[PDB]
């Protein structure tokens, strides 16, 4: 009399929200963009190769200056690179070698990392001594830690394998807000360029939108068949793209509240590990299990090129804030920068 | 048939059988080796995306084979006109030096690959099995220097041998004198043969004794190491046994009657072509069979 | 009654998720197209810059 | 190239050499992923060659370092650490991945070994199993297999 | 905290030898390259020698090359300057200077207190036209420095450094690479210039802004200073 009624109410709410989405689904993005000119074939070559890691590279991030990047690896080493000159700036040893994520603070005074130790650890890169020391280790996540992203020098959101997200205050070391609406392990994050919202994909094949200050889920996006491994905001913050294990990318948008485009080819069966956007949002770069990344025309959903210089599963890729280059990491322990 | 060079009594022949058989087999060898080694180098440079350390040795072997193959057509032109080299003085030295040095480099890099496999199969937990790329490149440079230094002796000679009107450009004339060029030949055979046989036997013994032979890829690997050993033996044994026969004939009869050397000389210069056939078999047996 | 509380929380979340204005797909697609077009000349990866103003060079 | 850039290059080279030393130190170690039910007698063997997150164990037999990563305690999904553990040489299983070997132990290619009274035989068996998988990675590394 | 303490010297007969020691504490001594800088009584700064991190690279001034030897003891965080065949021109106050080099770093941050040595008896030229400028507090003052050649490099950064030496204290960095503000210094210090001419601007003058200001180039060795400019109240 109670559980059945609540289930029926949830089902009818889902039906009505799907009907509302269908009502505004009169047009299609492909139909609108059929008239525009094709982007054409794009050849992008490996301009820099960064060597020094002795294990599979799992994460990388760019600095907001677009010159410095930090990469994590299974050898228990954080390496800050100078992409212009290929030479290393720092090498931060880690207590645990099972790190799965790394973040670069937008100011540049801190870096973060985390993994199977259930801790995103903040490292102070600007000390009076010439060493990098661990500023603080944030604990409280039940499961592993798959992504943490810096909001500012004092705030950071973390996604975790305990189906939750959390917003931390670094000085105190405690969570300020928690985000609990997912069902499966949260595998990815992407902060909006205004630092007001973020999207998180999980193993329940759904992506959710959160307001950082509100602390509650705002929109839920479905459509993928398997777990979502990557997520990325459109440059204007009004849309986002998801990559999953069922070998397809999907572009969702927040205002219309539904999927707009599907990026899949019959020649691709391997899953998707990473996804990013060009500075204008016209290109969508997705990395795959089949050892190479390929470029997608974001408005026409056709391939425009391939990044095929890696010898293993491309696990990470990212584009600079000024859009001059994209850096990809793989399990062959090399980082390549493409222009 | 007698022609002394400086102080060595040498018997030289210009038999017409050198033009009936050698130019065709060497032309086939040139074409197939050029195709195979060009494809091997093209794949090694462009479509590899992986170097490690053993591929460095394989690339050096391919380089030596290609350098011998590009040298083969001049041997063609020599053979088609019955020892009538006409290019000059420096280009004949360059031929002989390149041929000998590239054959030695191929043999040393075969031995290096064999020792690499032996250390990867009989001492898997050894430092040499996880060597750096810089160390591999430096070792390759040192080995190339070793071969070049062993072959300089052919680069510091005057080699327009005027055999009346022939202008002979041969390197293995039948001469009653033990020079470094023949001891180097015999060592090139025997010492790498000993190392290769030891490494192959120990690899097979370790693989079988660990009962790892029952796989399908491991059986193919054992078969192909047997095949590379057999190819080395088949290509390098006939010329060496003919050289040993020549030494025995010199020590028994001597240069006083050179007519007894005609058959042995023809046989030596016929079976010397299997040495280059080894270079033209190399892409098929070492690169195109990687699985 | 933990399951009942979870169901009530889900009902509230879906109800609040159902109370947001939704823009027609045509308008959102046009907005994305306009944003891509207006910043197309600013994209270094879409339009390859010459080697002079390339921070990464051989 | 300026003096400051030269000194930065020198710093990068010193970092490179420190990384080389650490990698040479870690190249003589092997990582083994240990699975179990948590209450299936695994602790017996764990303490047999012994003498939140994942537990690490260290034990040496013959110039070769083994790391044991007991993951039976975690209740999380089995497949969600596989992408993290995709590179381990072998997986050890105690009972009462297209090219990753499995080592099997009986408390009371797949390698099987019934537990003996002395832990020496068990350690020898696991050492032999790691030898074979290292032999075959070395072969792949070469090009033969 | 970070501190460098110097020892040795004080009275040396001409032609003799001496050993200056610099004991460091409070920071990772091994990661920093270390400089020796001396200033004569009533004279500006003068770079002496440089030993890099890991002892890989060593430089000497042309006036001390051969006679001086710089070395470090990383276990004990100690810096040495073996000084031999000492001349009457070698009497000065010697400073032990801390510097690290990576992208975005500030070298020449911390200076030791100094030790006094009394001896009984092609490169870039940095020029400061003025020597003494009396300014009342609260008035913006401009300090200029000129270079013999352009300090701008292909990287786009010009290697110009500014130091302030208060009366009785060692110099402290306030501007590095002509634009950046050193850690811990007030925001009223600003640096500008283009290639050859440079200007340091102080907005409001407190009682702690009184001292001698030095302009330094780090484009190439030998490192060169300019004749300092003194501010009076
Ligand atoms: C005729 C001939 C045949 N082979 C060689 C060689 O050194 O391989 C040299 N010459 O002169």
Numbering used by the authors:
A (entry chain C): 2 to 340
B (entry chain A): 9 to 299
C (entry chain D): 6 to 63
D (entry chain B): 5 to 55, 182 to 226, 259 to 270, 318 to 354
E (entry chain E): 1 to 121, 136 to 247
Mind quoting what the paper says about this structure?
Hydroxycarboxylic acid receptors (HCAR1, HCAR2, and HCAR3) transduce Gi/o signaling upon biding to molecules such as lactic acid, butyric acid and 3-hydroxyoctanoic acid, which are associated with lipolytic and atherogenic activity, and neuroinflammation. Here we report three cryo-EM structures of the human HCAR2–Gi signaling complex, each bound with different ligands: niacin, acipimox or GSK256073.
The NanoBiT assays confirmed that the BRIL-HCAR2 construct fully retained the Gi and β-arrestin1 responses to all three ligands when compared with the expression-matched wild-type HCAR2. The HCAR2-Gi signaling complexes were subjected to cryo-EM single particle analysis and the models of the complex were refined to a global resolution ranging from 3.1 Å to 3.7 Å. Acipimox has a nitrogen atom closer to its carboxyl group, and instead forms a hydrogen bond with Y2847.43. The HCAR2-Gi complex structures show very similar Gi interfaces to other class A GPCRs. ICL2 of HCAR2 forms a short α helix, like many class A GPCRs, that also contacts the Gα subunit. The principal polar interactions between HCAR2 and Gαi all lie near the cytoplasmic side of TM2, ICL2, TM3 and TM6.
